[PDB]
């Protein structure tokens, strides 16, 4: 029935990255008879012509599932290609509001936990600093909630403003005693943003930043420890539970040396997302093999550019195999709804104020925010 070796493709951005090392380590953990052979391709996540050329080359080669990253430029094209050709895609990148069920998003949504956290602290007037190349769905939700609840939001783009604009914003904020800031961007850009904040601007009295991301301990905030500077971050991956600690210990004591040079010293949560993606792919294919369903290629895939689309028949079943996967990984429970996005996740809200790392509660889809 199912062949022992099956090919999967990868749209990785850079070979010299922690995500590649996590991918290789997670693929090395496979001991089941279903084996995932990897075809990785390294391109910039931009210039959609090159990326659809890579996608068409992988489809002509005959891959089953594709694991990769996308940005705002290539999200629509990848989503349309996967929804039309019925090719299963699994990504750890940001989730979008509109997508077909044949693409799987591993990053949990932060559009509702942020609103609940803002509602917890009784915020009315604040400045929201967002990244343009990240997705404006969260900004849209924040603006809609502000319009409904009569809030004051000062929306600031990172790339649009300059240092003088930052000084004008901060001198306007200092005139009011209760100044409040929300920021949201990737941690690599957020590090430079926070360095800008500490470089000349006071990070002392007031200034309750709410870091809207998935990794709180990822960001080096030791300079934020000077005075005040209360910060409320979200965490998805806990390096204390038995299973994440066991897997991290196995990563520490690995017989095969990983790629790159160093993949530690505050490791990224996207590596955990890549590990979970490999794990869900392996579990889905194992469960599909257990059900005794034929998935053998009846001929050749051909080319993307054909006047009749003619999707492969069992591919929807492949998507079904990607839907009922459920276990516990580094990020916790991995469950998907009908739309194909991750659901029923627990987010640990960690707020620190001049003392240290301390968890104040958690967030669940059904229970909203439960303080602890």
């Amino acid at each position, epitope marked *: 029935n199912f062949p022992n070796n099956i090919q999967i493709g990868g749209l990785f951005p850079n070979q010299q990255s922690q995500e590649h090392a996590a991918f290789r380590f997670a693929l090395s953990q496979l001991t089941e008879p279903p084996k995932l052979l990897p075809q990785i391709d390294i391109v910039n996540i931009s210039d959609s012509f090159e990326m659809t050329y890579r996608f068409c080359s992988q489809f002509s080669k005959g891959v089953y599932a594709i694991f990769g990253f996308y940005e705002r430029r290539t999200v629509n094209m990848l989503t349309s290609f996967c929804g039309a050709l019925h090719v299963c895609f699994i990504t750890p990148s940001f989730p979008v509001d509109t997508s077909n069920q044949f693409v799987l998003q591993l990053r949990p949504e932060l559009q509702e936990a942020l609103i609940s956290i803002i509602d917890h602290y009784k915020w009315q007037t604040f400045v929201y600093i967002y990244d343009a190349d990240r997705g404006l769905s969260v900004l849209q939700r924040v603006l809609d909630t502000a319009a409904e609840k009569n809030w004051q939001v000062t929306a600031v783009n990172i790339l649009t403003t300059t240092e003088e604009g930052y000084r004008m914003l901060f001198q306007d904020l200092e005139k009011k005693k209760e100044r409040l800031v929300v920021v949201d961007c990737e941690s690599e850009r957020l590090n430079a943003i926070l360095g800008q904040i500490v470089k000349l601007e006071k990070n002392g009295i007031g200034y309750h930043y709410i870091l809207a991301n998935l990794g709180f301990m990822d960001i080096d905030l030791n300079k934020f420890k000077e005075s005040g500077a209360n910060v409320t971050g979200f965490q998805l991956v806990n390096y204390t539970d038995t299973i994440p600690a066991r897997i991290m210990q196995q990563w*520490r*004591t690995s017989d095969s040396r990983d790629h790159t040079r*160093v993949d530690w010293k505050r490791p990224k949560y996207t590596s955990a997302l890549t590990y979970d993606g490999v794990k869900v792919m392996a579990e889905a294919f194992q469960s599909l093999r257990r059900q005794r369903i034929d998935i053998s290629r009846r001929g050749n895939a051909g080319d993307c550019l054909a006047n009749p689309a003619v999707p492969w028949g069992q591919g929807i079943d492949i998507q079904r195999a990607l839907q009922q996967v459920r276990f516990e990984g580094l990020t916790g429970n991995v469950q998907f709804n009908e739309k194909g996005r991750r659901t029923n996740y627990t987010l640990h809200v960690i707020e620190m104020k001049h003392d240290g790392i301390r968890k104040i509660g958690y967030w669940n889809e059904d229970d909203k925010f439960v303080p602890a």
Partner: single-chain antibody
Amino acid sequence: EVKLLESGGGLVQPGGSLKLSCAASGFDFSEYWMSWVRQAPGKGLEWIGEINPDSSSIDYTPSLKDKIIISRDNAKKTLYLQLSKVRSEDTALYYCARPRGNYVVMDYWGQGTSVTVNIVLTQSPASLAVSLGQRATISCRASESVDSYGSSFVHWYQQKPGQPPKLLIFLASKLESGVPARFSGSGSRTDFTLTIDPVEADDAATYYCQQTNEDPYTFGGGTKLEIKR
């Protein structure tokens, strides 16, 4: 830069159990695993044993595994190796070392102590002596693959007689931290090559090349370097 203390090298009785106290000051074995190695006088170093970062499974020596047992505490950050049926040849220099893969600064071996009770690489030239301000190239030919898992997997460590060893270059992509040595692996490196520019009086030590691609990482004959006056 992590700090490792290893003192108390002295003579012992015939057949008695010896103990070497290795202290990982300012750090713990939880973050990085600690490994002890054994080196004889005028001979290459051999791995006496390895531990785990979680202190769950501890490995032993490839030559005499059951003869020596090493117990380490990560919270106390203290390691002690005991032995049974100790002979004259069994009294070798035992030196601890933190994990080199954690960081280049964390790649700081212990001081090492001696008591009186692999990698096949040829490094040339064996004798080196140049004045301060000169550049020298040393080639370490090996039998295994020049590069393992994309990049190279060979290392060079400069150890002096009576002084603690220091890893100069590791995996041809991360040299020694703290003091950046100019000698590092570069190019295709069919033989492990490192261009030192410039050498100094403190760099008068023997540089041993160990192929980390070939299991296990053991220092070979190496090449000796000095400073000409």
